Symmetry: D2
Subunit: 347 residues, 4 copies
Amino acid sequence: MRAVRLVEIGKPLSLQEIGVPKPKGPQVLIKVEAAGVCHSDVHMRQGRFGNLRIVEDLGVKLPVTLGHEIAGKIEEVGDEVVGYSKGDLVAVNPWQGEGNCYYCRIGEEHLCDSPRWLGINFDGAYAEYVIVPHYKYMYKLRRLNAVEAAPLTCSGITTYRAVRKASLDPTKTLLVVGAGGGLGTMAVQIAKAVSGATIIGVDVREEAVEAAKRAGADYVINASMQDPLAEIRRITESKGVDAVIDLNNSEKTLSVYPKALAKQGKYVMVGLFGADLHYHAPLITLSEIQFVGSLVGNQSDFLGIMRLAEAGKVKPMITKTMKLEEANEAIDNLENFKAIGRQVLIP
Amino acid sequence: MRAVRLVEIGKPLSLQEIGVPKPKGPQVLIKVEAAGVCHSDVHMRQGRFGNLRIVEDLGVKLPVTLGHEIAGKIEEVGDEVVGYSKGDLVAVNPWQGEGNCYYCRIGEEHLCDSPRWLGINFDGAYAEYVIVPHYKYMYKLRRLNAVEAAPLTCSGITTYRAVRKASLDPTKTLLVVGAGGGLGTMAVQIAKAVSGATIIGVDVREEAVEAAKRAGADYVINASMQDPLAEIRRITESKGVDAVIDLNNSEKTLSVYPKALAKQGKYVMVGLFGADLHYHAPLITLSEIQFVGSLVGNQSDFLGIMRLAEAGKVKPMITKTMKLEEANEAIDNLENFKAIGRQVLIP
Amino acid sequence: MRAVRLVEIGKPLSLQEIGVPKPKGPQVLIKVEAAGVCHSDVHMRQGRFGNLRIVEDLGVKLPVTLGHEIAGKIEEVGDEVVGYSKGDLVAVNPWQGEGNCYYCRIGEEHLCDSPRWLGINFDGAYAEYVIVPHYKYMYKLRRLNAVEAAPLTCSGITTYRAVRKASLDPTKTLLVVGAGGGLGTMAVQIAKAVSGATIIGVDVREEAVEAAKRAGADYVINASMQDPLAEIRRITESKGVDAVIDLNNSEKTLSVYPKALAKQGKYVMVGLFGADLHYHAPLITLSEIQFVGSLVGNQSDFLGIMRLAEAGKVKPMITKTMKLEEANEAIDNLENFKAIGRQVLIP
Amino acid sequence: MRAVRLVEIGKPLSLQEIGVPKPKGPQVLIKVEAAGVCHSDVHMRQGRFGNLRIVEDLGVKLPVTLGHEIAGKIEEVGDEVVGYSKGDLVAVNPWQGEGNCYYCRIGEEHLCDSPRWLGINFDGAYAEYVIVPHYKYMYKLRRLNAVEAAPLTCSGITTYRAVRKASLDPTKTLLVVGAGGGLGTMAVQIAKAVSGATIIGVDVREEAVEAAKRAGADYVINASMQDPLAEIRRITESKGVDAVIDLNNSEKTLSVYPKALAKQGKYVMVGLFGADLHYHAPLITLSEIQFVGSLVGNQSDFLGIMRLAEAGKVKPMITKTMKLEEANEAIDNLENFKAIGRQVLIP
Ligand SMILES: NC(=O)c1ccc[n+]([C@@H]2O[C@H](COP(=O)([O-])OP(=O)(O)OC[C@H]3O[C@@H](n4cnc5c(N)ncnc54)[C@H](O)[C@@H]3O)[C@@H](O)[C@H]2O)c1
Ligand SMILES: NC(=O)c1ccc[n+]([C@@H]2O[C@H](COP(=O)([O-])OP(=O)(O)OC[C@H]3O[C@@H](n4cnc5c(N)ncnc54)[C@H](O)[C@@H]3O)[C@@H](O)[C@H]2O)c1
Ligand SMILES: NC(=O)c1ccc[n+]([C@@H]2O[C@H](COP(=O)([O-])OP(=O)(O)OC[C@H]3O[C@@H](n4cnc5c(N)ncnc54)[C@H](O)[C@@H]3O)[C@@H](O)[C@H]2O)c1
Ligand SMILES: NC(=O)c1ccc[n+]([C@@H]2O[C@H](COP(=O)([O-])OP(=O)(O)OC[C@H]3O[C@@H](n4cnc5c(N)ncnc54)[C@H](O)[C@@H]3O)[C@@H](O)[C@H]2O)c1
Ligand SMILES: [Zn+2]
Ligand SMILES: [Zn+2]
Ligand SMILES: [Zn+2]
Ligand SMILES: [Zn+2]
Ligand SMILES: [Zn+2]
Ligand SMILES: [Zn+2]
Ligand SMILES: [Zn+2]
Ligand SMILES: [Zn+2]
């Protein structure tokens, strides 16, 4: 089968011809019908997230097929698989745990001590077929098609968990930083669909700000055209925002938005652009603000985003679909910030 | 009446003779029987917490009587006060809110927009008498004497709130940084009394480490005699700690202990030594750690620490009591780190 | 001023001429612009909730002006009131606490040991003016008019609290019993606006079922035309519902809907029709279901429903407005179940 | 191997000679070193819990080996088992789920749609060996011996979950009904070890009341010697208790203790004696009390009780150990209420 893999750090992904794996035990072989392209693949291709080298620091062994936003058709199942037939369309949660470690036992599968992350340290969906380590991480699609579903296995589940950690309610205001992108448009949608909170989206490109407006943001700010702090101060009447979901975490965002936090404000850190958080400690203490990291999601979150989307309450804003052979171009679009919403590969 | 007040920044507190206030409305005039000395008064005397000047940045108007760990006898009450008689011994929650702002309405009175903090921006207990803005912030002592009670209105309520925010349970390990001090000995006790969690206390003085051992810590480390990270790594079997309560937040603690956090670890920031938090953002995100500020406590927290102490489940470790005229010497002991547990003034 | 009061149990409310109270201290005199009519006033007029006599069992002292859904204009304030001017339009939370008891201290003011409930044990809004015990229980209207606001001080805040206690999320299904009524239409809206959960509304009148459909229910059932259990079984695919908000709690509802609960299901009991809950204990234990009572709401809940409505995310379905002199007729409509949505008096 | 099994309802358990199962896949064959005797086995032998027949209503297929408090030595593992060696001493969580259903995905394994409950619908520990469906449900003992550990797999995990659902804190009072029994002594211990709450234990036998006193109860009541309601009213100063953990749920307890609940009180229903809950609905609503069922525990709870016990913070009060051949006599002791604490079989 054809596969687009990360063969060498700092080089374009490589289109290779490799064998189709045989599913055994609880594994499932999925015929890929859609593979979302995440800005994380820009970092993968660069070989790192900040100063955390995927090889030396995270244990990633090259070559590896990328693609962790997964949706497809069941081709073959192992002997232990129960509840699926050939042809069934499913979304796949790629953040899998082995089930016995501390984190797996308390329902935090994605923080497993021996993680199996399809598209990161295990082969992903940028191919004709993909192996699912365990069938319990799949979701039978009922209303969604594969293209709409794929993005939910990362951008959806990640922002669903992030919106929950932001502890939002009708009396609060949320600020989404980088609201016009893949996760940004998703964070805005979920917050609109289930929190009742007022939403402010900020980006730095005309089309991105427009995308955030389309995603449902009550207020949108173009940080290139105006001072976002003055505007946020105006919108919240000097109270500041109760929560920020930063989908960048660059020196540009981290040196600005934490100052917009209200007392008890939660700064949810999702983006992986690679900067260092730097804030005066007494200021954190006196305002009781929090800086909380959020990583993809667990089985519970997956269930949550999939049911929300199946109900039509949220829907990935797919602005572009292209062939698997165009994986590098789709990634260049994110690296050059020439994309909005989400792009999906349709092998 | 005699009062020890902060008259000038960077100078010794001043013993003055001032008028005794007349309680009106819901106010209450308390005859001070005990006034705890907090390391925060070292910062007050220096005129700042980190680079946050108490005058220009926090609105503190000099002169102001210090002393926010309050316990005493009811001398006189206003016309609105209901439920107290002259002579009743009470502990006083000094972190008072006006009751109508957003934070007061959601039960976070210490984060009131118009805070009345006895000993900080309003006169405190380093005097013969002290005015209590509102009687609902008092607790009638049933078993505790004034000396034992006073420290609970700051070191107790603060660390009670911090231990709650650390989200501890029997499967977790807590690390208390500066465990031999006033708050340190209290954090260790509360965590021992109600979380079931394993406790590690770290300090840098032989007597402090011993105090932390006496407070109930399962493991104690003298960071002056050995590498605390190697030891914490050994105790937690390389898992790291699920929570840290840092009662320093100095460049020395912040550049070390965050590295000891396990995945999902919570770094509760209480200390006000004045450094800057600096940590690689991708590391925060990938391990889902959190840096959360905690400030004194609300009416709910107060109730919690007072009942815990009245039941004899925790008890401030008072290692020294002295006269009100000795306020500066007691503060010097904290500034020079020549104290353990808690010191209390007995006017 | 004119007032419609409960003078005698089992008799029509009485239109009387009484003196206008003078606001002192933190009290506020409100010129009533709208007074919602709640089915609770049907019980008040009958002198009881189930077998709990309002006089002998609850301490209600007759005569008392009814009306606890309050919205109006500030006429006069006491000496302590801060932040309001004559003419300001406000909604009033009638479930007031004195502020010092255990329940007031933990932010559950409606469960105060010495409750001041306007319209129940204190004079209410079925009059030209009404006294507000404490100004902190008011909310300044920004977008809502008085008629739209009034119902939020009971049907809104109550069902907001009930929807929160139902612990809903996108993977869950909520069942609202009596969904076409005043609270029913509100419960459905709030659940639609902030939980992401699938909603099933059930009633027994064609117009009520239609109202519930208009409120946003995904599925509606007329228990008079069909077996509600068979239908709920079909909709949830035999899983049952994760939560039920019963706005009746009659022998007719309690002997039916608890059987529709899924494992861990929460049966939120709001209605006061007066029956006895009867369920096999082993069944409760083995399926971990819960029967939880919910009563009006606290200051936090009030804030939540008011902000949700001001944002236009929910809006009371007012199906009828009439003059204060018509109070008895409006109550008869609820007693005879010849009403849907909410009725509001406009003195 | 020898096994004590439920062969016929209403008859004494039968000592049979059956084959030793062969562990395959993730299964594990454990050599039983201790098997706790639970009052649930009295109900099993009677063929029902209340009016819920274990055969017709729960799907239990006879014959079945009883015994769900499990601790033993690893004899043999399947091909998928990872992390264990022959001889390793482990405690076994018998409340196992298949891992794919809704409840398994949200971390509520014990509420699995296709439950595998060792000792209930699958063979248990009342034998020489026992098969563990999945190895991830085991806990490697480090400090506890098998006899001390076994009881934690039911009485411990169940009461750990129940104490957590009681939402206890230092300002609250807990009432344990049947506090001198197997679960009672455990509930009292855990509440003493991790809640900070004041504890009241009630029983009706002199030795049972004494056992509850030894378990750590602050107050003990013998309901045979005095009116428990008058005493509870006295202890709580008429406030009532914030939580009740009823380990009976008989007409005798259910018609008494709910009346002792404070406003917002939580009545946790654990016992399976078989009565019907009957309480006036308006009373539930007006006091916001809750009746919540609690069933054994999930993987998270198991981790919690095992770590609490390994730390020596709680310890089953084993008052009797006897041979496997004496299973019926041990059960008669519970059925006749001639036992306190916990009894363990040592095959
Ligand atoms: N924590 C997790 O589990 C997780 C999961 C998925 C992706 N991510 C990370 O999230 C980040 C975003 O991913 P994505 O797929 O949404 O990317 P994207 O390229 O679709 O969107 C990024 C957005 O950031 C905006 N942006 C750039 N500079 C900005 C500035 N100075 N201020 C405000 N906005 C700015 C862009 O205009 C763009 O709309 C990446 O670093 C990715 O690796 C994290
Ligand atoms: N956030 C809040 O609401 C709040 C409330 C009260 C106090 N505080 C702050 O908490 C801090 C501690 O106050 P306290 O009264 O306990 O002080 P303290 O002087 O009693 O104790 C401080 C402890 O820190 C230890 N220490 C010093 N250097 C150390 C190092 N490098 N590593 C480890 N331990 C070290 C000392 O030996 C001492 O035992 C102060 O900065 C104070 O202002 C904050
Ligand atoms: N717990 C609280 O704090 C609180 C607050 C407000 C009102 N209430 C109580 O809530 C109840 C409802 O009040 P409301 O103002 O919404 O009343 P309402 O008269 O507006 O609505 C009641 C609804 O119940 C429906 N109904 C009647 N019989 C039914 C049956 N057998 N099955 C299903 N639906 C049926 C009616 O058709 C109607 O739509 C009253 O008992 C009231 O006292 C409680
Ligand atoms: N929900 C669950 O998951 C779960 C788990 C284990 C056991 N259980 C159930 O818990 C119940 C208790 O089990 P156990 O093993 O502790 O039993 P046990 O026999 O050890 O203890 C029961 C206690 O109840 C006391 N008692 C009897 N009548 C009483 C009365 N009128 N008032 C107060 N106390 C009274 C006895 O004196 C005795 O100490 C059983 O019905 C059992 O099936 C439930
Ligand atoms: Zn991604
Ligand atoms: Zn794992
Ligand atoms: Zn202090
Ligand atoms: Zn305030
Ligand atoms: Zn009402
Ligand atoms: Zn009160
Ligand atoms: Zn049992
Ligand atoms: Zn299952």
